[PDB]
Design a protein around this ligand. Structure first.
Ligand code: HEM
Ligand SMILES: Cc1cc2nc3c(=O)[nH]c(=O)nc-3n(C[C@H](O)[C@H](O)[C@H](O)COP(=O)(O)O)c2cc1C
Ligand SMILES: Cc1cc2nc3c(=O)[nH]c(=O)nc-3n(C[C@H](O)[C@H](O)[C@H](O)COP(=O)(O)O)c2cc1C
Lengths: 396, 492
């Protein structure tokens, strides 16, 4: 606690349903606000933070905005269809809760259970990665799913102990789960400063966690494809050339990620990555060779749509659901599933197409995609004195 | 210093009569000195000694200059003779508090070990924030400011942000190696301490010495380039320095009295510093507004000083080269052609620097330069003729990294070690070091590489290097009118 000024009772009156009626809620940002000051300093830090200066973090969201829509007109759109298949499941929606370690932190009672409950409770059901570090037992989780259609997914951090892993691997292949997400981006953890900052007060490879095997490789991989039947997605790719390495070692999926930028500041945003990639995957003919996935930044229908439009087999969010959960639990979480589904939906029509398959790039103004500028330090001295036009008054 | 002479005598209200900065005598410690000559030529504005002339002064001189100061820069016969008795009070100078207010107590008692534990600091920025609350309205002023509209200084840093990474994945990075080597010696870390002047302002007490300490003492250890305008002597800073395998570099401002210089050099070469970095981007003293803005709440070329000689020229560097065994580095190059010229005279390296924005506002980011330049160095088959350095504005290891992949042999920080030393002294400095090295190692890891030679342009997303932008000066009236959307509530 101990940033926990008995103010846990500012927090308390807030949680203490100060929260609005879970349907006054309007977008994913709404969750996130309520989250930011009801959760614990400690939880909120863990969750919110990002690598160092938190550019890549923020950059991932913004890069969506170099991208604008060319939409399509007088296209009959009474009915739109928004579903698609991932790793040959077929899939309500085309986005996916994703793997968000320690939810017991903002959901003490329920944890990532409240998540699955969430992705299955509702007319809509969506996938789920299960962090290799949940607050819960894979079993404890994998069991609170209602619909037996709800799909489910293992993200896994290899180990040091090629044993413990070779165990969980099949331990989980035992319990159901339709694939493997190996999270390569995370040999060390990143220096998530908002965390450290209260984990006290309020040659140092102390920040390589040894759950993660900092020594992972393409062998260790081309291995594990053999030690299993499940498919494999390499979560955390960060360039073109690595992508091709999955393509060649012929694995299955990829996520273009950087862990919500919690990893390395000045990593690019995945949407940039996607965008340069996909088209190369035309000219090699590894075109269908590989499902590609994208994450982080994602807060709107539009975001998602854009991703798709660009190539994504499927798009992932963490935080949003992560807040969702921690304060309406599984209900919160499914409203989320609800929310984001509608944005996908209305936009789809205003966009002029009816199947996710119909989502091709030509629907995108992609001409500014690389306008990723840094302006010059505006002029302190002159702005300070300058003074602007003013609006007419009102009387007396 | 001292002198004594033997002979002369003198007086507690008749040398009170030279105050006219035309005719200038003063009394320092025991002794009396004719100024009139050196006046216009004295590093920190000339000015401050018009405004104090015909006094004692020790208040003012003592705690902020180098020792052997007199007995280096003045002739044996300005060294006039003893004061007999003293002088009366105003007519012996209280030092030296431009803008200070019995508030060096909001200050004092903030320093009031009120300052966090050194293990609390997490980046370079916090030193600077601390520093900024504790240092002296001038110590802050001076350390912190840059020329003019302060634009090259922010740009030096911001420029790093138009570079992004392309990291390598699945690479065994259990062990990584940030050491590298520089200019002949081999080094622990790929970056150094640039020279800063007067640290005794922020560390009134050991100044440049605690820096030498902070980079010698720990297990990771680092190159200190020493300023020709240190608060301490070099002798001091060099027999200050705790470690043997520690390494120290001299920065030269060449005097107009090319002798004084030639002695500086031979002497430093004897305490075996290891390189000389001749700083060339200060023929005039650039103009540091916030620092001026002090005096005034209390020429045309009052910015020259026979001290920093403003007429040094490649012939001069080429003639330096023959009087010395130390490798020469030219500090403050700002574009590709003067880099090649250095190459063509075969000096042994250059620093791309613009002194951290203090000199010429609208100098470039030395990052951007280095980018444009290095490849050029290739196409002239003049690749490794030349070690390239780079400074200004570097605040996180990713920065350092970005420069290394770019070709830099090495990178310098200035203020952060200053602010660090200032608040915290030698552990301050080391602590910084440590902070930085960790960042580097850690990101060097995330990037998918294990040693410094594997940093390379193939790791960088350069595609928006050049995107320095200026946005159209935009829309007070509309912005004023637009109400943006809004997040939901909680319920009273
Ligand atoms: C007599 C031989 C002297 C020598 C060799 C000398 C040398 C120096 C040097 C290297 C500096 C650092 C300034 C910078 O940032 O550019 C300095 C600054 C300073 N000097 Fe001296 N100085 C001398 C005499 C004096 C005298 C007579 C005074 C009378 C007060 C004086 C007062 C100061 C002060 C107050 C500063 C710091 C102010 C600032 O630049 O913000 N010095 N001097
Ligand atoms: C609080 C938190 C915990 C995370 N834990 C994991 C994890 O255990 N394993 C994993 O592969 N990704 C982890 N991630 C990364 C995500 O799966 C995902 O890449 C990310 O959140 C995408 O960005 P976004 O949150 O803004 O939507 C986590 C992210 C957050 C915010
Ligand atoms: C307070 C101060 C004093 C300086 N004095 C000198 C000096 O005497 N000689 C020199 O060559 N450079 C001097 N410099 C410039 C640097 O050595 C260096 O180029 C600069 O500090 C690099 O930028 P940074 O402070 O953003 O890291 C000084 C810089 C500062 C900030």
């Amino acid at each position: 606690a101990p940033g926990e000024t008995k103010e846990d009772i500012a927090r308390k009156e807030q949680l203490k349903s100060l929260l609005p009626p879970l349907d006054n809620i309007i977008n994913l940002y709404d969750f996130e606000y309520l989250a930011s000051q009801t959760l614990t300093k400690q939880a909120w830090a863990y969750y919110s933070s990002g690598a160092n200066d938190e550019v890549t973090h923020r950059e991932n969201h913004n890069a969506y905005h170099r991208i604008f829509f060319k939409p399509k007109i007088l296209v009959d759109v009474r009915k739109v269809d928004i579903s698609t298949d991932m790793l040959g499941s077929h899939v309500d929606v085309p986005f996916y809760v994703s793997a968000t370690a320690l939810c017991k932190l903002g959901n003490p009672l329920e944890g990532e259970k409240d998540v699955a409950r969430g992705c299955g409770q509702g007319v809509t059901k969506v996938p789920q990665m299960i962090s290799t570090l949940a607050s819960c037992s894979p079993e404890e989780i994998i069991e609170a799913a209602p619909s037996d259609k709800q799909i489910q997914w293992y993200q896994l951090y290899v180990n040091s102990d090629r044993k413990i892993t070779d165990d969980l691997v099949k331990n989980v292949e035992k319990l159901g789960v339709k694939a493997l997400f190996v999270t390569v981006d995370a040999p060390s953890l990143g220096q998530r400063e908002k965390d450290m900052k209260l984990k006290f007060s309020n040659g140092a490879s102390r920040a390589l966690s040894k759950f993660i095997d900092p020594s992972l490789t393409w062998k260790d991989i081309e291995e594990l494809k053999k030690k299993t039947k499940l498919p494999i997605v390499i979560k955390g790719v960060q360039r073109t050339e690595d992508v091709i390495k999955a393509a060649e070692i012929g694995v299955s999926g990829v996520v273009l990620s950087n862990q919500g930028g919690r990893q390395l500041d000045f990593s690019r945003a995945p949407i940039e990555v996607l965008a340069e990639t996909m088209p190369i995957l035309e000219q090699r003919n590894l075109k269908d060779k590989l499902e590609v996935f994208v994450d982080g930044g994602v807060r709107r229908g539009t975001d998602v749509l854009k991703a798709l439009c660009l190539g994504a087999k499927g798009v992932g969010l963490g935080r949003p659901f992560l807040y969702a959960n921690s304060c309406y639990g599984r209900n919160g979480v499914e409203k989320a599933i609800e929310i984001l589904r509608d944005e996908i939906e209305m936009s789809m029509r205003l966009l002029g197409v009816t199947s996710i398959a119909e989502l091709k790039p030509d629907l995108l103004d992609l001409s500014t995609l690389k306008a990723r500028t840094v302006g010059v330090p505006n002029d302190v001295l002159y702005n300070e004195v300058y003074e602007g036009p003013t609006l007419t008054e009102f009387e007396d």
